[PDB]
């Protein structure tokens, strides 16, 4: 069980949540915490899910 606080600079939280839901990777058992308006979110869960969230957060800047 690991958690991460991630800061995305060019993408709001809602965009990332929608992307994960569309890719069926997001699971409604360990939801992403953080207000939708701001751009600094937190996520706690199994290592695979947390690593996936971190990778897709740091690989959505282009």
């Amino acid at each position: 069980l690991i958690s991460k606080v991630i800061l995305l600079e060019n993408i709001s939280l809602n965009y990332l949540i929608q992307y994960l839901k569309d890719a069926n990777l997001y699971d409604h058992r360990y939801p992403i915490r953080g207000n939708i308006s701001d751009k600094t979110f937190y996520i706690s869960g199994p290592p695979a899910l947390v690593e996936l969230v971190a990778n897709t957060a740091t690989l959505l800047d282009k």
């Binding site: 690991i2 958690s3 991460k4 606080v5 800061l7 600079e9 706690s44 971190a54 990778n55 740091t58």
Partner: peptide
């Protein structure tokens, strides 16, 4: 890229 702003907890 090396996930500039990403902090590990627990």
């Amino acid at each position: 890229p090396v996930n500039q702003v990403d902090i590990i907890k627990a």
